[PDB]
Amino acid sequence: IETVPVKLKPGMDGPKVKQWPLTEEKIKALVEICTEMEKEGKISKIGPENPYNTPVFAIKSTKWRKLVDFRELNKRTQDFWEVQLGIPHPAGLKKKKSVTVLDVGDAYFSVPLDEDFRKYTAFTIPSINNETPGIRYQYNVLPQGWKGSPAIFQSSMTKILEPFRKQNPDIVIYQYMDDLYVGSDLEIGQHRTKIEELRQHLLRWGLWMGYELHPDKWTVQPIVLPEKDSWTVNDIQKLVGKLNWASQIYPGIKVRQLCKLLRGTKALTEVIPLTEEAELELAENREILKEPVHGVYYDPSKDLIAEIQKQGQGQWTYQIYQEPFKNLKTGKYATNDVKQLTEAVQKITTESIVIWGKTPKFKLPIQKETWETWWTEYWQATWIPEWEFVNTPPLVKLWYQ
Amino acid sequence: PISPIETVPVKLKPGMDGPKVKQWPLTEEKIKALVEICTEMEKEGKISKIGPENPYNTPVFAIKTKWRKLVDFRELNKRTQDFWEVQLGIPHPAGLKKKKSVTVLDVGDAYFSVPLDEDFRKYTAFTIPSINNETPGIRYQYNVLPQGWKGSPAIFQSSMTKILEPFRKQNPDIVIYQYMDDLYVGSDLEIGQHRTKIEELRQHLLRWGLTTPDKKHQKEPPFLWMGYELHPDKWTVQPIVLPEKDSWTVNDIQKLVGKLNWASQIYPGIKVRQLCKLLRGTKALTEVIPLTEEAELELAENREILKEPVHGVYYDPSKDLIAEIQKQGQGQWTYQIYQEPFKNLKTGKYARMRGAHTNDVKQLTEAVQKITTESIVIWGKTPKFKLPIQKETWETWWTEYWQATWIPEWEFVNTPPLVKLWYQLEKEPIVGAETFYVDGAANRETKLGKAGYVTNRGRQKVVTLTDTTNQKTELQAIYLALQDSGLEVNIVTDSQYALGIIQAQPDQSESELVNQIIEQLIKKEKVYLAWVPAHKGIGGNEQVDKLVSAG
Ligand SMILES: Cc1cc(C#N)cc(C)c1Oc1nc(Nc2ccc(C#N)cc2)nc(N)c1Br
């Protein structure tokens, strides 16, 4: 075809991002893959006159697949993939009974890439012990990972799906990066049969989460207040802190009564008996906390942020919000920390996409370097969200279950 | 010669035109030398004469020995495209495989041997001025990589890599390491079968415009390379001499820490901490620093380690790496990495405080993480560790700590001092233990503070502090509960900050206070520590808050 011209356009210059170290086996996989890609005309060796660089890694079940971190490039191309060739996101999508995620990235290998943009897709396979200088390539065709690729292709993506959509008008199909999200209120065998049908449309033309997703079964995790026969002073204090915190998100919470309960200067171990009203308040708060937050609404113009807390014993908790503590969804996830953490990250990101058509920035409770070393080992998506490292303030841990 | 290899396109920076700098008038000596150097270069095709239509210029100078052309590409460099960094790192001897014979070839007039993009040559124009700038100068521009230009390093290396590409394919046995003008070649061929293969290369390089020195102007072991001393089946660091000095300047200590530090890649147990402490406080480079006893203590222990030489072994990609760590003092960790027991591939140290307070267990993990990345770089694989911490100490810490922490394949080795958490806080409040509601206020303006407590057994103390913050007070208030209290105590606070510190089980701090508090927590049999919101009228919070609110 003819190639859609692209631009960063102002005084954002392209990406100059260091290549994180890779294990021997990943490096090999990567040269094996990139020798083929060169063969097929998808990428070309480049010379030193290309100062740009984007990191690449390899990931896995039985075959290795190549993954490129276009996070910066995406950041610096924002105006083009968002405002100049946006893909609208359908609100309908979360409401569906079953959503199936399908990889379509192999499509982008058929469209070529604007010749004057190619320079920005530079990456480096590096070498063990820095012995050799490291093989430099760049993309000639639309790359998987860059949010520009589905921007371009949507014109094509639309023609391919036209009949399927015409014949299935209650099936909602959404494209995010390399994947297609396909939602129905069909019964599962039917939902599943329609997915095969959809695959075959694609097959002419060229083509943690278990199987499908179930967005209509996606209820938030309430902040939960222990029920208790018996109450100690400690227990009330824990309870007062835990509600006093909740007040600053949930409108309607009240603590007065329990503060009454804590009258003097007493021992923590000392038991203290539930009041008439004190009990009344408790259940009244319990009720508020079950229902989501009144007042909090998604602003598409602000970034989505995601916090995660290690709850111990294979459990994690999480919150998505735009302005701090004003939560838009809160949740939960259930063999080693980093693995578990990267699964949660993929889960939370997947939901985030279904709901808002955008990935959250993560606040990860882990040492940067641990994470950078280990994340690629279990990661299995084709996107990579943005992330920063953070120390979980120990109370927030406690206030979520 | 001038390689036939195709050129690399080059371009000025987007909003920029090439330089138009004025040629300062030169002396005749220099005029003469330049004319001389320039004709000869002209005659080998390195530069070509041009007219006065070419409107670009750079300055030329000559320094003495015998004469040398110095061009100043300050403007053209500031004005020329950026490029990719040459090498992303430097190989480590530990990562190298052993070799029977090695040969180090040097490429002659390297840059001048590689062509410059025709389109770019224009901008390299320079001018030999006439005596006292009466008449028009002689104008030349470059046909090859000029010396001092921003692009030369990179373009040379690519060129050389392209030129080697085939030869490597054709000779998978042999190995070549390209750095700058140098090539470093090695094989496990026997000296004559090797020497021949060198030749196929030298001719190979000539076939492409690159000349090298003749068949008996080339070194024999041990090779000196990037501060290392490389031998066929071993390596170590170029020789380290620690000066005997009755008086140490800042500079002297600076250079020593450098050498020791460099030394620590193979000599185990080098320590540099007490020497580095001397460097705190901005002092002149010539200022003499009195050695403390502990620095002196350290300097001799380093001398012992260094007295007899130590070497390291090369890597064998069939066997596993085993990495051992030892705690050699406060904040000081030392490691050695090997494949067969005690044939060390390399050695090293870690001594880094991340944040303000920390504990041995956290430190050990930081250390593991550092060595893990380091191994990916040098060997492409991570090791098996042999750590001085009980699996059960490690288990206890990770599960109950809120950060995700994960270390790969390891084992406990009993090489003391052992890593241990020195106190553990209780999980539930203690019956028959006194409860200290503690608090701290501080006037933000007088900076006086008040640190106090109230208890459920009636006690109340309220001390007065001077120049401190809110943070310090709520910490002084805890120190107090722990001093005045018994072997088991419950302590209630409104500071999340204080809780933070302490919940993390520190055993080391940058605060003197927190170190006092740690001492105390080590003495206790039991501690439980709880938090409540400030100013919410809580039983007991409210009472300390009153007592502590004057000022
Ligand atoms: C060949 C060579 C010589 C010198 C230099 N000088 C420096 C370097 C980086 C070299 O490259 C390599 N050397 C070795 N092992 C090795 C073994 C013994 C000796 C000796 N003596 C030198 C190198 N392995 C490699 N893969 C590479 Br690449």
Side-chain angles (χ1 to χ4, degrees), chain B residues 137-199:
Chain B
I138 321 171
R139 309 253 296 167
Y140 294 106
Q141 75 180 200
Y142 278 84
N143 308 319
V144 291
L145 295 190
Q147 196 93 42
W149 173 62
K150 193 180 155 184
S152 288
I155 289 176
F156 183 84
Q157 268 284 307
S158 149
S159 299
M160 171 71 89
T161 297
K162 276 174 179 87
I163 287 173
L164 281 159
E165 192 175 313
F167 177 107
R168 303 210 225 221
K169 286 160 187 184
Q170 277 274 330
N171 301 252
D173 291 333
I174 226 72
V175 91
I176 295 177
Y177 171 68
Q178 174 181 347
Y179 185 62
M180 301 194 67
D181 328 357
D182 302 325
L183 268 22
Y184 294 85
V185 188
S187 78
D188 286 302
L189 286 177
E190 335 78 64
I191 218 137
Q193 240 214 107
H194 183 241
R195 279 197 249 108
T196 283
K197 210 105 109 92
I198 293 312
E199 288 301 328

Coordinates of all heavy atoms in Angstrom, one line a residue, chain B residues 137-199:
Chain B
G137 N 43.9 32.4 1.6 CA 44.4 31.1 2.0 C 44.2 30.0 1.0 O 43.5 30.1 0.0
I138 N 44.8 28.8 1.3 CA 44.6 27.6 0.6 C 43.4 26.9 1.3 O 43.5 26.8 2.5 CB 45.8 26.7 0.6 CG1 47.1 27.6 0.5 CG2 45.8 25.8 -0.5 CD1 48.3 26.9 0.7
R139 N 42.4 26.4 0.5 CA 41.2 25.8 1.0 C 41.2 24.3 0.6 O 41.4 24.0 -0.6 CB 40.0 26.4 0.6 CG 39.9 27.9 0.8 CD 39.0 28.3 1.8 NE 37.6 27.8 1.5 CZ 36.6 27.8 2.4 NH1 36.8 28.2 3.7 NH2 35.4 27.4 2.0
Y140 N 41.0 23.5 1.6 CA 40.9 22.1 1.6 C 39.7 21.7 2.4 O 39.2 22.5 3.3 CB 42.0 21.5 2.3 CG 43.4 21.7 1.7 CD1 44.3 22.5 2.3 CD2 43.8 20.9 0.7 CE1 45.6 22.6 1.8 CE2 45.1 21.0 0.2 CZ 46.0 21.8 0.7 OH 47.3 21.9 0.2
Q141 N 39.1 20.6 2.1 CA 38.1 19.9 2.9 C 38.5 18.4 3.0 O 39.2 17.9 2.1 CB 36.8 20.2 2.2 CG 36.6 19.3 1.0 CD 35.3 19.5 0.2 OE1 34.8 18.7 -0.5 NE2 34.6 20.7 0.5
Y142 N 37.8 17.7 3.9 CA 38.1 16.2 4.1 C 37.3 15.3 3.3 O 36.1 15.4 2.9 CB 37.8 15.9 5.6 CG 39.0 16.2 6.5 CD1 39.1 17.5 7.0 CD2 39.9 15.2 6.8 CE1 40.2 17.8 7.8 CE2 41.0 15.5 7.7 CZ 41.1 16.8 8.2 OH 42.0 17.2 9.1
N143 N 38.0 14.2 2.9 CA 37.4 13.2 2.1 C 37.3 12.0 3.0 O 36.7 11.0 2.6 CB 38.4 12.8 0.9 CG 38.8 14.1 0.1 OD1 37.9 14.9 -0.2 ND2 40.1 14.2 -0.3
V144 N 37.8 12.1 4.2 CA 37.8 11.0 5.2 C 37.5 11.5 6.6 O 37.5 12.7 6.8 CB 39.2 10.3 5.2 CG1 39.3 9.6 3.9 CG2 40.2 11.3 5.5
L145 N 37.2 10.6 7.5 CA 37.0 10.9 8.9 C 38.0 11.9 9.6 O 39.2 11.5 10.0 CB 36.9 9.6 9.7 CG 35.7 8.7 9.3 CD1 35.5 7.5 10.3 CD2 34.4 9.6 9.1
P146 N 37.6 13.1 10.0 CA 38.6 13.9 10.6 C 38.8 13.7 12.1 O 37.9 13.1 12.7 CB 38.1 15.4 10.3 CG 36.8 15.2 9.7 CD 36.4 13.8 9.6
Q147 N 39.9 14.1 12.6 CA 40.3 13.8 14.0 C 39.6 14.8 14.9 O 39.8 16.0 14.6 CB 41.8 13.8 14.0 CG 42.4 13.1 15.2 CD 42.7 11.6 15.0 OE1 43.3 11.2 13.9 NE2 42.5 10.7 16.0
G148 N 38.9 14.4 15.9 CA 38.2 15.4 16.7 C 36.7 15.7 16.2 O 36.0 16.6 16.8
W149 N 36.3 15.0 15.2 CA 34.9 15.3 14.8 C 34.1 14.3 15.5 O 34.6 13.3 15.8 CB 34.8 15.2 13.3 CG 33.4 15.4 12.8 CD1 32.6 16.5 13.0 CD2 32.6 14.5 12.1 NE1 31.3 16.3 12.4 CE2 31.3 15.0 11.9 CE3 32.9 13.2 11.6 CZ2 30.4 14.4 11.2 CZ3 31.9 12.5 10.9 CH2 30.7 13.1 10.7
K150 N 32.9 14.7 15.8 CA 31.9 14.1 16.7 C 31.6 12.7 16.2 O 31.3 11.8 17.0 CB 30.7 14.9 16.7 CG 29.6 14.6 17.8 CD 28.4 15.6 17.7 CE 27.1 15.0 18.3 NZ 25.8 15.9 18.1
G151 N 31.6 12.6 14.8 CA 31.1 11.3 14.1 C 32.1 10.3 13.8 O 31.8 9.1 13.5
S152 N 33.4 10.6 14.1 CA 34.5 9.8 13.6 C 34.5 8.5 14.3 O 34.3 7.4 13.7 CB 35.8 10.5 13.6 OG 35.8 11.5 12.6
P153 N 34.6 8.5 15.7 CA 34.5 7.3 16.5 C 33.4 6.3 16.1 O 33.7 5.1 15.9 CB 34.1 7.9 17.9 CG 34.7 9.2 17.8 CD 34.4 9.7 16.5
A154 N 32.2 6.7 16.0 CA 31.1 5.9 15.8 C 31.3 5.2 14.4 O 31.4 4.0 14.3 CB 29.8 6.7 15.8
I155 N 31.3 6.1 13.3 CA 31.5 5.7 11.9 C 32.7 4.8 11.7 O 32.6 3.8 11.0 CB 31.6 6.9 11.0 CG1 30.2 7.6 11.0 CG2 32.0 6.5 9.6 CD1 30.1 8.8 10.2
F156 N 33.8 5.0 12.3 CA 34.8 4.1 12.2 C 34.4 2.7 12.7 O 35.0 1.6 12.2 CB 36.0 4.6 13.1 CG 37.2 3.7 13.0 CD1 38.1 3.8 11.9 CD2 37.4 2.7 13.9 CE1 39.1 2.9 11.8 CE2 38.5 1.8 13.8 CZ 39.3 1.9 12.7
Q157 N 33.5 2.6 13.7 CA 33.4 1.3 14.4 C 32.5 0.6 13.6 O 32.6 -0.6 13.5 CB 32.9 1.5 15.8 CG 34.1 1.6 16.7 CD 34.7 0.3 17.0 OE1 34.0 -0.7 17.4 NE2 36.1 0.2 16.8
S158 N 31.5 1.2 13.1 CA 30.5 0.6 12.2 C 31.3 0.0 11.0 O 31.1 -1.1 10.6 CB 29.5 1.5 11.8 OG 29.0 1.2 10.4
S159 N 32.1 0.9 10.5 CA 32.8 0.5 9.3 C 33.6 -0.8 9.6 O 33.3 -1.8 8.9 CB 33.8 1.6 8.8 OG 33.2 2.8 8.5
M160 N 34.4 -0.7 10.6 CA 35.2 -1.9 11.0 C 34.3 -3.1 11.3 O 34.7 -4.3 11.1 CB 36.0 -1.5 12.2 CG 36.7 -2.6 12.9 SD 38.1 -3.2 11.9 CE 39.4 -2.1 12.6
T161 N 33.1 -2.9 11.8 CA 32.3 -4.1 12.1 C 31.8 -4.7 10.9 O 31.8 -5.9 10.8 CB 31.1 -3.7 13.1 OG1 31.7 -3.3 14.4 CG2 30.3 -5.0 13.4
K162 N 31.5 -3.9 9.9 CA 31.0 -4.4 8.6 C 32.0 -5.1 7.8 O 31.8 -6.2 7.2 CB 30.5 -3.2 7.7 CG 29.0 -2.7 8.0 CD 28.5 -1.4 7.3 CE 27.0 -0.9 7.5 NZ 26.6 0.0 8.8
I163 N 33.3 -4.6 7.9 CA 34.4 -5.2 7.3 C 34.8 -6.5 8.0 O 35.4 -7.3 7.3 CB 35.6 -4.2 7.5 CG1 35.4 -3.0 6.6 CG2 37.0 -4.9 7.4 CD1 36.5 -1.9 6.9
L164 N 34.5 -6.6 9.2 CA 34.9 -7.9 9.9 C 33.8 -9.0 9.7 O 34.1 -10.2 9.7 CB 35.2 -7.6 11.4 CG 36.5 -7.0 11.6 CD1 36.6 -6.3 13.0 CD2 37.6 -8.0 11.4
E165 N 32.6 -8.5 9.4 CA 31.5 -9.4 9.5 C 31.8 -10.6 8.8 O 31.6 -11.7 9.3 CB 30.2 -8.7 8.8 CG 28.9 -9.5 9.0 CD 27.6 -8.8 8.4 OE1 27.5 -7.5 8.6 OE2 26.8 -9.5 7.8
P166 N 32.2 -10.6 7.5 CA 32.4 -11.8 6.8 C 33.5 -12.6 7.4 O 33.3 -13.8 7.6 CB 32.9 -11.3 5.4 CG 33.6 -10.0 5.7 CD 32.8 -9.4 6.8
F167 N 34.6 -12.0 7.7 CA 35.7 -12.8 8.3 C 35.4 -13.7 9.5 O 35.9 -14.8 9.7 CB 36.9 -11.9 8.6 CG 38.1 -12.6 9.2 CD1 39.2 -12.8 8.4 CD2 38.0 -13.0 10.5 CE1 40.3 -13.5 9.0 CE2 39.1 -13.7 11.0 CZ 40.2 -14.0 10.3
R168 N 34.5 -13.2 10.4 CA 34.0 -13.8 11.6 C 33.2 -15.0 11.2 O 33.5 -16.1 11.5 CB 33.2 -12.9 12.5 CG 33.9 -11.6 13.0 CD 33.5 -11.1 14.3 NE 33.3 -9.6 14.5 CZ 33.7 -8.9 15.5 NH1 34.3 -9.4 16.5 NH2 33.4 -7.5 15.6
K169 N 32.1 -14.8 10.4 CA 31.4 -15.9 9.8 C 32.3 -17.0 9.3 O 32.2 -18.1 9.7 CB 30.5 -15.5 8.6 CG 29.3 -14.7 9.1 CD 28.6 -13.9 8.0 CE 27.5 -13.0 8.7 NZ 26.7 -12.2 7.7
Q170 N 33.3 -16.6 8.4 CA 34.2 -17.5 7.8 C 35.2 -18.2 8.9 O 35.7 -19.3 8.6 CB 35.1 -16.8 6.8 CG 34.5 -16.7 5.3 CD 34.8 -17.9 4.5 OE1 35.8 -18.7 4.6 NE2 33.9 -18.2 3.5
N171 N 35.3 -17.6 10.1 CA 36.3 -18.2 11.1 C 35.7 -18.3 12.5 O 36.2 -17.7 13.4 CB 37.5 -17.3 11.2 CG 38.2 -17.2 9.9 OD1 39.3 -17.7 9.8 ND2 37.7 -16.4 9.0
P172 N 34.7 -19.2 12.6 CA 33.9 -19.1 13.9 C 34.8 -19.5 15.1 O 34.5 -19.1 16.2 CB 32.8 -20.2 13.6 CG 32.8 -20.4 12.1 CD 34.2 -20.3 11.8
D173 N 35.8 -20.2 14.9 CA 36.7 -20.7 15.9 C 37.3 -19.5 16.7 O 37.1 -19.4 17.9 CB 37.9 -21.4 15.4 CG 37.6 -22.7 14.8 OD1 36.5 -23.3 15.3 OD2 38.3 -23.2 13.8
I174 N 38.1 -18.7 15.9 CA 38.7 -17.4 16.3 C 37.8 -16.3 16.9 O 36.6 -16.3 16.5 CB 39.4 -16.8 15.1 CG1 40.8 -16.3 15.4 CG2 38.5 -15.6 14.6 CD1 41.6 -17.5 15.6
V175 N 38.4 -15.5 17.8 CA 37.6 -14.3 18.3 C 38.3 -13.0 18.3 O 39.5 -12.9 18.3 CB 37.1 -14.7 19.7 CG1 38.0 -14.2 20.9 CG2 35.7 -14.1 19.9
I176 N 37.5 -11.9 18.2 CA 38.1 -10.6 17.9 C 37.4 -9.7 18.7 O 36.2 -9.7 18.7 CB 37.9 -10.2 16.4 CG1 38.7 -11.2 15.4 CG2 38.5 -8.7 16.2 CD1 38.6 -10.9 13.9
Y177 N 38.1 -8.8 19.4 CA 37.4 -7.8 20.1 C 38.0 -6.4 19.5 O 39.2 -6.2 19.6 CB 37.7 -7.9 21.7 CG 37.2 -6.7 22.5 CD1 35.8 -6.4 22.6 CD2 38.0 -5.9 23.0 CE1 35.3 -5.3 23.2 CE2 37.6 -4.7 23.7 CZ 36.2 -4.4 23.8 OH 35.8 -3.3 24.4
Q178 N 37.1 -5.6 19.1 CA 37.3 -4.3 18.5 C 37.2 -3.2 19.5 O 36.1 -3.1 20.1 CB 36.2 -4.3 17.5 CG 35.9 -3.1 16.7 CD 34.6 -3.5 15.8 OE1 34.2 -4.7 15.7 NE2 34.0 -2.4 15.2
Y179 N 38.2 -2.5 19.8 CA 38.1 -1.3 20.6 C 39.0 -0.3 20.0 O 40.2 -0.5 20.0 CB 38.5 -1.5 22.0 CG 38.3 -0.3 22.9 CD1 36.9 0.2 23.0 CD2 39.3 0.3 23.5 CE1 36.7 1.4 23.8 CE2 39.1 1.4 24.4 CZ 37.8 2.0 24.5 OH 37.6 3.1 25.3
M180 N 38.4 0.8 19.6 CA 39.1 1.9 18.9 C 39.9 1.5 17.7 O 39.4 0.8 16.9 CB 39.8 2.7 20.0 CG 39.0 3.3 21.1 SD 39.8 4.5 22.2 CE 40.0 6.0 21.2
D181 N 41.2 1.9 17.6 CA 42.1 1.6 16.6 C 42.5 0.1 16.8 O 43.4 -0.4 16.0 CB 43.4 2.4 16.5 CG 43.3 3.9 17.0 OD1 42.2 4.3 17.3 OD2 44.3 4.6 17.0
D182 N 42.2 -0.5 17.8 CA 42.8 -1.8 18.2 C 41.9 -2.9 17.8 O 40.7 -2.7 17.8 CB 43.3 -1.9 19.7 CG 44.2 -0.7 20.1 OD1 45.1 -0.3 19.2 OD2 44.2 -0.3 21.2
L183 N 42.5 -4.0 17.5 CA 41.8 -5.3 17.4 C 42.5 -6.3 18.3 O 43.7 -6.2 18.4 CB 41.8 -5.8 16.0 CG 40.7 -5.5 15.1 CD1 39.9 -4.3 15.5 CD2 41.2 -5.4 13.6
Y184 N 41.8 -7.1 19.0 CA 42.4 -8.0 20.0 C 41.9 -9.3 19.6 O 40.7 -9.6 19.7 CB 41.8 -7.7 21.4 CG 42.3 -6.3 21.9 CD1 41.6 -5.3 21.5 CD2 43.4 -6.2 22.6 CE1 42.0 -4.0 21.9 CE2 43.8 -4.9 23.0 CZ 43.1 -3.8 22.7 OH 43.3 -2.5 23.0
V185 N 42.8 -10.2 19.1 CA 42.5 -11.5 18.5 C 43.0 -12.7 19.3 O 44.1 -12.7 19.8 CB 42.9 -11.6 17.1 CG1 42.3 -13.0 16.5 CG2 42.4 -10.4 16.2
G186 N 42.2 -13.7 19.4 CA 42.5 -14.9 20.1 C 41.9 -16.1 19.6 O 40.8 -16.1 18.9
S187 N 42.6 -17.2 19.9 CA 42.2 -18.6 19.5 C 42.8 -19.6 20.4 O 43.9 -19.3 21.1 CB 42.7 -18.9 18.1 OG 44.1 -19.2 18.2
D188 N 42.3 -20.8 20.3 CA 43.0 -22.0 20.9 C 43.6 -22.8 19.7 O 43.4 -24.0 19.7 CB 42.0 -22.8 21.8 CG 41.7 -22.1 23.1 OD1 42.6 -21.8 23.9 OD2 40.5 -21.8 23.4
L189 N 44.4 -22.1 18.9 CA 45.1 -22.7 17.8 C 46.6 -22.6 18.3 O 46.8 -21.8 19.3 CB 45.0 -21.9 16.5 CG 43.6 -22.1 15.8 CD1 43.3 -21.4 14.5 CD2 43.6 -23.6 15.6
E190 N 47.5 -23.4 17.7 CA 48.8 -23.5 18.2 C 49.7 -22.5 17.4 O 49.3 -22.2 16.2 CB 49.4 -25.0 18.1 CG 48.3 -26.1 18.1 CD 47.5 -26.4 16.7 OE1 48.2 -26.7 15.6 OE2 46.2 -26.2 16.6
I191 N 50.8 -22.0 17.9 CA 51.3 -20.7 17.6 C 51.4 -20.4 16.1 O 51.3 -19.3 15.6 CB 52.6 -20.3 18.3 CG1 52.6 -18.9 18.7 CG2 53.7 -20.7 17.5 CD1 53.2 -18.7 20.2
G192 N 51.7 -21.5 15.3 CA 51.9 -21.3 13.9 C 50.6 -21.4 13.0 O 50.5 -20.8 12.0
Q193 N 49.7 -22.3 13.4 CA 48.4 -22.3 12.8 C 47.6 -21.1 13.0 O 46.7 -20.7 12.2 CB 47.6 -23.6 13.3 CG 47.2 -24.7 12.3 CD 45.8 -25.3 12.7 OE1 44.8 -25.1 12.0 NE2 45.8 -26.1 13.8
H194 N 47.9 -20.4 14.1 CA 47.3 -19.1 14.6 C 47.8 -18.0 13.7 O 47.1 -17.3 13.0 CB 47.7 -18.8 16.1 CG 47.0 -17.5 16.6 ND1 47.8 -16.4 17.1 CD2 45.8 -17.1 16.9 CE1 47.0 -15.5 17.5 NE2 45.8 -15.9 17.4
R195 N 49.2 -17.9 13.8 CA 49.9 -16.9 13.0 C 49.5 -16.8 11.6 O 49.5 -15.8 11.0 CB 51.4 -17.0 13.2 CG 51.9 -16.5 14.5 CD 53.4 -16.2 14.5 NE 54.2 -17.1 15.4 CZ 55.0 -18.1 15.0 NH1 55.2 -18.4 13.7 NH2 55.7 -18.9 15.9
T196 N 49.0 -17.9 11.1 CA 48.6 -17.9 9.7 C 47.3 -17.2 9.6 O 47.1 -16.4 8.8 CB 48.5 -19.4 9.1 OG1 49.9 -19.8 8.8 CG2 47.7 -19.4 7.8
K197 N 46.4 -17.7 10.5 CA 45.0 -17.1 10.5 C 45.0 -15.6 10.8 O 44.1 -14.8 10.4 CB 44.1 -17.9 11.5 CG 42.6 -17.8 11.1 CD 42.1 -19.1 10.5 CE 41.1 -19.9 11.4 NZ 39.6 -19.6 11.3
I198 N 46.0 -15.1 11.5 CA 46.2 -13.7 11.7 C 46.4 -13.1 10.3 O 45.7 -12.1 9.9 CB 47.4 -13.3 12.5 CG1 47.2 -13.8 14.0 CG2 47.8 -11.9 12.5 CD1 45.9 -13.4 14.7
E199 N 47.3 -13.8 9.5 CA 47.5 -13.2 8.2 C 46.3 -13.2 7.4 O 46.1 -12.2 6.7 CB 48.6 -14.0 7.5 CG 49.9 -13.7 8.2 CD 50.3 -12.2 8.1 OE1 49.8 -11.6 7.1 OE2 51.0 -11.7 9.0

